[PDB]
Amino acid sequence: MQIFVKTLTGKTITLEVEPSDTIENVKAKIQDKEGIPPDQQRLIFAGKQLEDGRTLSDYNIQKESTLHLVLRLRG
Amino acid sequence: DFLRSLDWTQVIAGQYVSNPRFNISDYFEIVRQPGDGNCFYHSIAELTMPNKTDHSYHYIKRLTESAARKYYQEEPEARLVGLSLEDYLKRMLSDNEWGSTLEASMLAKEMGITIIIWTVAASDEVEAGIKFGDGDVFTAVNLLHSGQTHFDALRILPQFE
């Protein structure tokens, strides 16, 4: 299933995912497509940061849901 | 006018994102901070403390410690970091240890202020902002995050008041 992820710059990418994908899996897909390390990713849906060992299903994320990707920024 | 037109999306309660595009020097003066690992705290101290010096950042780190005691347990970003509070503090308080969006969110709540981190592309144009707190840009402690690895302090140019 297709879902949407909007990054910090407002750039919106598609990912092909399954309801049983973990949050960790979705991050690895973001990394392969966009080059962003999982360590800096905060994935956010419906006002809450998603937890690594849960699945898209756990949060009722469905076809064509939008996630926000916010980055942890160090300096 | 442009600064008052920014579109902040509240992604999670107390945290907002925007993706306007502009030249940082069109709207801010940049106050450069040393590259010694501490520039996040240097940059906060430049904007919040009177008679700031290269030593002022120690107090900011000390507020970050106080802040962490209260807030580290409910900060969403702490879930990335994965440390106990006492291990987090020990690493936070270490020499040259970089500050981050984690400390910004906690300091915002502790100091009762709004902190904005503006992140710029390799091109130097702004491509995003993250805001910690409900204040606007005119009210906030504005920071510049560049090369993805450095913080400097920003002051609103006098003409935008």
How many CA atoms are closer than 13 Å to the CA of A21, on its beta-carbon side? 20
> Hey, which residues of B are catalytic here?
39, 150, 152
Q: Which two tokens stand for residue B100?
A: 């981050």
> Is B104:B153 a contact under the CB 8 Å cutoff?
no
Name the structure determination technique: X-ray
- Other beta carbons within 10 angstroms of residue B143's beta carbon come to 28
- Considering CB atoms only, which of A8, A72, A75 is closest to B80? A72
> Is B126:B119 a contact under the CB 8 Å cutoff?
yes
CB contact under 8 A, B100 and A75: yes
Output phi, psi for B104, to 5 deg.
-60, -45
CA dihedral (B69, B152, B116, B48) positive or negative: positive
Spatial CB neighbours of B64, under 8 Å, sequence gap ≥ 6? B41, B92, B99, B103, B106, B107, B110
Q: Max Cα separation, chain A?
A: 37
CA distance B81 to B123: 30
Nearest to B49 by CA among B149, B141, B156, B161: B141
Nearest chain A CA: its distance from B102 CA (Å): 8
CB contact under 8 A, A72 and B102: yes
DSSP string spanning chain A? Answer: -EEEEE-TTS-EEEEE--TT-BHHHHHHHHHHHH---GGGEEEEETTEEPPTTSBTGGGT--TT-EEEEEE--B-
- Other beta carbons within 10 angstroms of residue A62's beta carbon come to 11
Q: Which residues of B12-47 are buried (b: 16+ CB within 10 A; e: fewer)?
A: beebbbbbbebebeebbeeeebeeeebbbbbbbbbb
Q: Which two tokens stand for residue B112?
A: 């009762």
User: Whose structure tokens read 């956010």?
Assistant: A44
Nearest to B111 by CA among B103, B120, B99, B101: B103
CA distance B78 to B71: 10
Resolution limit, Å: 2.3
* Local structure of B144: helix, strand or coil: strand
- Considering CB atoms only, which of A8, A40, A75 is closest to B40? A75
CATH number of A1-75: 3.10.20.90
Query: Which of B17, B81, B154 is best to mutate for the A interface (most A CBs within 10 A)?
Result: B17
CB contact under 8 A, A44 and B11: yes
Nearest chain A CA: its distance from B19 CA (Å): 5
CB contact under 8 A, A8 and B128: yes
Q: Tell me the fold of B1-161.
A: Cathepsin B; Chain A (3.90.70)
